[PDB]
Point group: C4
Chain length 400, copies 4
C-alpha cells in the first residue's frame, strides 16, 4: 504494500470501472479486480498453493473435453433449473464459500453477495464460510428474498463445543445444509501472500505454523458420523479428491460430496475435479450408489460450457469461488447478479447449440472424452535450434 497506491487504485476505480453492460465474460471481472484491489486483496484471493499447477489445471482440464452436439432438435425453449439437496434451483451453479469477502467489499462483505444472489430474477444458492467477514446472522438476514437458499460451510473446531453451538446457531437461522470442508486440515502455502507479506514472532510453530485450532487437523470419518446424529441438515463433505472417499461418503450415508481441491490453494498436484468426476461417476453407477449421493464439483469454472461439461458427466451442481469474489469487489451486489446473468445465459445459449432442453438431458454422450487424459508435458524444446530458425513471412505492403 500500500504505497499510498490508493490514489491510483481509487482513480483506477473511479467511475473508471466501465458500466456493468460492458461486461462480457467472468474474465472481465478478474482483469478488473486485478487492477483495482489492494495488493493484499489480490494476493489472498487470486493465489493457489506453491507453483499453482492444480489451480491452473482445474481450468485446462475443461479445455480437453469437446462436445458432440445434436442438430435438428426443436430448441425454442430451454429449462436450466434443477434440485440440489431437496430444494429446487433456477440454475445448476452456486456461489461457493470464500472467507474474507471484506478484503474486497469493505462495507458489505458477504451481505452484498446474498443480495446479488437474490435481488434479480435468477436466485442462486450462497455457501457461507465458517470464515466469513460478516456473521451468519447479518448474512442470512441480508438476503432480499425468501426463495433464495443459503448453505453453511463449516470448519470443525478443535474445541468441539464451539461447533455444537455453531451448528445450532445455523439450523435456527434457516441454512438448508452444511458443507463440511475436509481439504484444509493444514493450510496450503500461497507464496504470493507470503511474498508481499515479507514487507519489512508468534512464539513457536514450524510446519506446525500452518496448523490451526479452528481446523481440527484431527477430523475423521467417525466425527462425521457423530455429526449426523446432532442435526437435521443434510451433510455434504467438501474436498474429496479421489474416488475411494466418495465411496466412503456413501458407505456412511452423508447426502453429498463436493469434488474440490480448494480452488488450487491446498495440495498442489491434486487433479482437476472434472477428471475425478469422470473417473468416479461410472464406479458409483456400477455399485448402485448414484441415486444415493449428490456429487458437486468446483475449481476453474469460467464459462457455461464448463458448467455443461460437469453436468453431462453426472454432477448435480457446480460451484464458483473467484469469479464471484471479483464481481463482488469491483461492483458489489450488482456485480454479482450480473456475473449470474452472464453465466445463466451461456448455459442456455450453449444448451440450444447442443440440442437439449433440460438439465436431465445432459448426458455423457454429448461429450468427447478421447483426450481428457491427455495431460502431458513435452520434452524441453531445443534452444539453439529454435533460435537460429526463422519461419515463413507475410507480404509486406508497399511503396509510398
Amino acid at each position: 504494500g500500500e504505497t499510498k497506491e490508493d490514489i491510483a487504485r481509487k482513480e483506477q476505480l473511479k467511475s473508471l470501472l466501465p458500466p456493468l453492460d460492458n461486461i462480457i465474460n467472468l474474465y472481465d471481472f478478474e482483469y478488473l479486480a486485478s487492477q483495482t484491489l489492494t495488493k493484499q486483496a489480490w494476493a489472498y484471493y487470486s493465489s493457489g498453493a506453491n507453483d499453482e499447477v492444480t489451480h491452473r489445471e482445474n481450468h485446462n482440464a475443461y479445455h480437453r473435453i469437446f462436445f458432440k452436439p445434436k442438430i435438428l432438435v426443436d430448441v425454442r425453449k430451454v429449462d436450466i433449473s434443477t434440485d440440489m439437496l431437496g430444494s429446487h434451483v433456477d440454475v445448476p451453479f452456486y456461489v461457493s464459500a470464500t472467507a474474507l469477502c471484506k478484503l474486497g467489499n469493505p462495507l458489505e462483505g458477504e451481505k452484498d453477495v446474498a443480495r446479488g444472489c437474490g435481488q434479480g430474477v435468477t436466485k442462486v444458492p450462497q455457501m457461507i464460510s465458517t470464515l466469513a467477514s460478516c456473521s451468519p446472522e447479518e448474512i442470512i438476514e441480508a438476503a432480499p428474498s425468501d426463495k433464495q437458499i443459503q448453505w453453511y460451510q463449516l470448519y470443525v473446531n478443535s474445541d468441539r463445543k464451539i461447533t455444537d453451538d455453531l451448528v445450532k446457531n445455523v439450523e435456527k437461522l434457516g441454512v438448508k445444509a452444511l458443507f463440511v470442508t475436509v481439504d484444509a486440515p493444514s493450510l496450503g502455502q500461497r507464496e504470493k501472500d507470503m511474498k508481499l507479506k515479507f514487507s519489512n514472532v508468534e512464539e513457536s510453530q514450524g510446519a506446525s505454523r500452518a496448523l490451526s485450532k479452528f481446523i481440527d487437523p484431527s477430523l475423521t470419518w467417525k466425527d462425521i458420523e457423530e455429526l449426523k446424529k446432532k442435526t437435521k441438515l443434510p451433510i455434504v463433505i467438501k474436498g474429496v479428491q479421489r474416488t475411494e472417499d466418495v465411496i466412503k461418503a456413501a458407505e456412511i450415508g452423508v447426502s453429498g460430496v463436493v469434488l474440490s481441491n480448494h480452488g488450487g490453494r491446498q495440495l498442489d498436484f491434486s487433479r482437476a475435479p472434472i477428471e475425478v468426476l469422470a473417473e468416479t461417476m461410472p464406479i458409483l453407477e456400477q455399485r448402485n450408489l448414484k441415486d444415493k449421493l449428490e456429487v458437486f464439483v468446483d475449481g476453474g469454472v469460467r464459462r457455461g460450457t464448463d458448467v455443461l461439461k460437469a453436468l453431462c458427466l453426472g454432477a448435480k451442481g457446480v460451484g464458483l469461488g473467484r469469479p464471484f469474489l471479483y464481481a463482488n469487489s469491483c461492483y458489489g451486489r450488482n456485480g454479482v447478479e450480473k456475473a449470474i446473468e452472464i453465466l445463466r445465459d451461456e448455459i442456455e445459449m450453449s444448451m440450444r447449440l447442443l440440442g437439449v432442453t433440460s438439465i436431465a438431458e445432459l448426458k455423457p454422450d454429448l461429450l468427447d472424452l478421447s483426450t481428457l487424459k491427455a495431460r502431458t508435458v513435452g520434452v524441453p524444446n531445443d534452444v539453439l535450434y529454435n533460435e537460429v530458425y526463422e519461419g515463413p513471412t507475410l507480404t509486406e505492403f508497399e511503396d509510398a
Copy 2:
C-alpha cells in the same frame, strides 16, 4: 429500401423524431418512414444498431450493408408509415457504420492506396488475410475474423489438419494430374467451393457477392459459389452477375419461423437456376463473437434468437422440404456421426460436417476428425455411396483439401479466405485465390504420386496422431524463469 410509397401519408421530422425508443422505434431509410418496433427483436444483425439509432435517417448505415430486396420482403405493408416531409434536423441523420473507427479511414485508405502489392506477388491465402487485417475497417475485421467465445473451435479446425501426415508414393508417372470431380450431379473443375458468408459488402461495398460470382466463373477454372440467405445482394443480382453458363450456384437456406416466406424463397431459387439447397442447421441460436461485441460497447439468451432462423427446425421439416422441391438437399452444420446416419436414413443427398467456421458452439470438434470417424462407419452400413460428405473450417492449404479428399469427403468449402481476397482485390482476388489453391493441390498430388481425385485414399495418410489433441500441465513458471538456455556463437565485430 425501395419505397412502395403508397402515395401519400405525409410525415415530419418531429412526428418521427418523437418515436426514438423501443416500445415503438421509427426510422427514416431514404425518403420514407417505417415503424421498426415489432421488427427489431428479429433483425438478423442485432437489436442494438437499430434501437440506438431511433428515429433518425439510418440511410447511411443501411443502404451500403443490405441486399436491395429486404424491405419489400420482410417488412409488413403496415410498417411503411409515410414519405418524410423534406428532410430531418441534420445531426439526426446517421453517418456510415464503423464502430471504433477513430477518423482512421486515412491510414487504411492510404494503406490500400496502391500500397497493396500487385496481385502477382500473392503467394498464399494467409497473404490475403494479413492484407485484409491492415485495411478492413476494425469492424469488418472483427465480423469476418472472429469465432464464438474463447475461439478454441475456430483454431482447432485448422490445427487438426496439422496432426495428419502423408505416406507418399515415389516412382509413379506424374506427368499428367487431374483434379476435376463431381459434386451433387455436376462436373466441377476442382474439389473445393466458396461457402456461404453474409455481409460481403462490408469489405467490398461496390459489389459484395456479385464479385465472388465473377471471380468464380470468369477464368479457366470455375468454382461452385454457395449463396447465403443473409447475403448483402439479392440472389437474382448474384446469379445475373455470373459470367459462364458453366459455373454452378448453390443456395444456402435458413428456414424462417414463417414457413410461407421459405416456401416462397425456395420456389424463387429453383427458378433462378441454383443447383442445390444447403440447409444450415448449426445456428438455431446466434454464436457469441466477443471481439465484435466489445467493439460496439467500446468504440438475454433469447436476444440470440430471431424468427429469421427458426429455433424449431426438426428432421421432420427436412423430410417435408424434399416433397416440395427437386433440388438435391444438403444438411449444413452436422457435427457428429449419429446425425450423418440420420441424414442417410431420411434420404437427403449430402451433409456438410461443419461448426460454422467456429462461430457457433465453442468445444465443437474439427470437421476433419468427425470425417475420420464417420466414413469407416458409413462403409460398414454400406451408406457410403448414398450420401456426399463435404467439410469446411480452417482449410488454408492445398494439402488440407487433399487430407479431406483422402478421408472420403467429396469436396471442401472455404469461407474466410475468399472474404479477404474479395475485400482486398475484388473479383481478381477471388480468381487469384482459386489459382493459388488449384496449383497447391496439383503440386501436392504429383508429390504424393497420385494422378486423379479417384486415387486419393486413406492409405496415403498417417492418422496415428489425429486424436493427439492435448493440454499440457500448467508448467512451472517459477523454475523456467530462473533458467538460461545455451547460446550460439556471437561474432567479434558485431
Copy 3:
C-alpha cells in the same frame, strides 16, 4: 535484395567470423551463415516447402527418443568406422548432395567440400549433386586424398541420352555409386525464395511451372530396372517416404534406399525419416530383407546423438545437407573438416556414455521409443485465461 548490403555482410564477415576453435556445435555455423550469406544464399539454402512443418519435424522427431545407456562397460576405446556400399568408412555419416554450393562459396563451390572431406584425418563420403555448381570432373579431381569416396547423385533427364552420357562420364571418373533422387518429380515451393524473389514471363507454365525437363516427372520403377542393366555402380533410391517403397526397392534389387524427404523442401507433411526408419526396420527383418538392402536416412541431423539414434534403429549411415553447406560458406574446406571433427567427437563421446565400443553394437535396446509417436498438437490455449493470470515470483533483492 542486395541493397549494397555487402558493405555490412562483408564487414560482418571480416575476420569477424570468430576463429574455427571457437566453434562448438553444427548450430554455430548456421547462426554464422544466417548473418553473412546474401539474402538469396540464405533463402535458397535454409527454406523448406510451404509452412516448413516437415523440415522442423525432421529435427524434433529425434527429440522424442531417449536412451537406455549401459554403465560399468570398459569404454576406454571406441571405433565408429563402418562399411557403406562395399566401401569402408571412418565414420557412419556423409555429406549429402546440395545443388548450388557456389551461392555460398563463390570461388570453390563443391571443390572446397571435397577438400574438407579428405584433407584431415577423418575422410567422409561426398554425394555429388547432378545440380552442382562445379563439374563432376573438377570435383572428383579436387579430392586431396585417394582413400576418400565420392558418390554421384543423379537427376534423370526427360532426354535419356543425356543420363546415358552422364552415367558413363561418372563411372569413368571413379564415383563409387549412384544415388537416384525420386522425391522431386515436381519442385517444392519454398516461399522464402519466391518472397525475396518478388523483388520488383517464361512464356507459359502453371503448376506446370514447377515441372522441369531435367527431372523426368515420368520416372518409374521400370526405369530403375533399365538403369541397373546399363551400369556396375550399386544403385540407391533417394527419397523413400514410406515402408511399401522400401520393400519395392528390395523386390527389384537396388543396393540401398535413402529415407529422405529432401530436407523438408518437397512435400510438406511428409513424416520425419527417423520415424519411417523405425516403422520400417522390423518389417524388413520379418521378411528377410535386412541383409539385402542398406537403408540410409537424412533430415534434421545436428548432433552425434541424432546419428546414434538412426544407427540403433538400423541405418547404415546417415546424411547431413545444411550444416555442411553452412560450414562450407563461412569458412570453406576448413569449415567443413571442422564440422566433421565436431560430429565425429560427439559420436565417440556419446558412445562411451552409452556403453558400447563399435557401430555393430548400436541396437534398438539402447533406445526408449515409448513416445516417438507422441507427435501432438494441443487445443488452442485460452487467451483470456492466460492473460489475466500471473504466476509465482522470485525474491527481488534489496535496499540501496
Copy 4:
C-alpha cells in the same frame, strides 16, 4: 601446494619462464616449481587453463579452487623441480579466475552487499537459485548451472515430476506426522540428502564444503552429506568441520586408473568415519557443458578422458571392491532397469538412479521414470528389500520427494539447490534449505493424509501421464501470426 621443498634445487624466473608450452609446461604454485607437462592431459579441470598459463605464478588461480591435499597426492616427487629464486617478472603472475568477468565484481559484490534479503525472507529453493544467478561470477554460474549439450535431460529431470499427480486421502487424523527414515543402516531425520558436488569453493571460497558440513549438522534436523572425490576441501577437513557426532557422511568415489591411489583413498575414508561408498559410474567420459566452454573461448573425444576417472571400470571391479571394504557400496549413475538388477545380482547395497544432474549424456531419461518402471520389476523378482534405491535430478519441492518416496525410493538427493544456498549464505543458507524442504514434506504429507514415510505407497499417485513426454508438430507460424486473440475489458480512465 604445500611444498615438500626437497631442500635445494634453486630455480629462476627465466629458467621457468622458458618452459611455457605443452611438450613440457612448468608452473609456479606458491614459491615452488613443478613440471605439469605429463599431468595436464589428466587435470580434472581441463588441459587448457594450465596449458595456456604456461610458466607463470598460477598461484592465484589454483590456491582458492583446490583441496589442500592435491600436490602431495597426485604429483610425482620428480615433478617438484625447485623453490623459485625470489619472484617472477610481475605480469607473468596470474590473476584470479573469472573468465568473462569484465571488471564486474563491483555490481555483484554490491549486489550481495547486503542487497541480499534476510534469510527469513526465503520462501523456496528457486529463491536461492535466482539470488545465486545474480551474484555468482559468470563462470561459477555456468559451472554450477549447466547440463550436457542441449540440456534436455537436465530440464526433463524436473519436468517428469510435473506429470505425476496425487490422489490424497481426506478425513484421516493428521495431527502428528513423522518424516524420519533409515538409509543404509542409519536413522536419518529426513528422506533427502545433499549429493556430491565438486568445486564448492567457486561460490563459497572461504569454506566450500566445510560450510555444507555445518549447515547439515548444526540444527535440529541433520542431513546426510555426500562428499565428492573431486571436492575443493580435503575429506579430513570436511569431516572435522562437522558439528554433531549424529550427522552422517558418505563418500562419493571416482576410481582412478592407478588402483593403488583408490585403494589408498578407500582405506583413509573408512578411518575418517564415512558410512557408505557411492561409486559414480556415469562419467567415464566428461559431459560437454557448452555454456561453460563458450565462456572460456569467449571471455579430441580423448581430451574428455582422464586417468582420474577410469574409463575402464567394470562390474568385476565392483565385485573386487566389496572384498576390500566393510562400508556398504552404492552404484551412482544407474540409468536403466537392467543395471539395477545386475547391481542386485553382484550383491551391492543400493544404487542411485541418476544421469548426474543432466551433465553427462543428453537423452538420458528422468530418474523418476526409471524408478517407476524399475520397482514393480524388482518386486516380481523379490529383489525389492535387498537393494536400497535412491534417485536424484531436478528435485526442487517437497512434493517431488514424496513422489519419489511413493514409488519406492529410500531417499532423494539434491545437488544444485545446496550449491546455491551455500554460495549466497554459507552454512545458514544450507540449514535454511533443509528447513524449507523438511517443512514442505511435512505440510504435503498432512494434505495427502499419511503420517509416516512407511505409508507413502503408489496408490497415492496418479501415473497415467508419466510417459506423456511429447513433442508438438512444428506448428504454423504463418497462420498463428496473422491471428488475434479475444481481449478483456479495458477501463475508461486507464
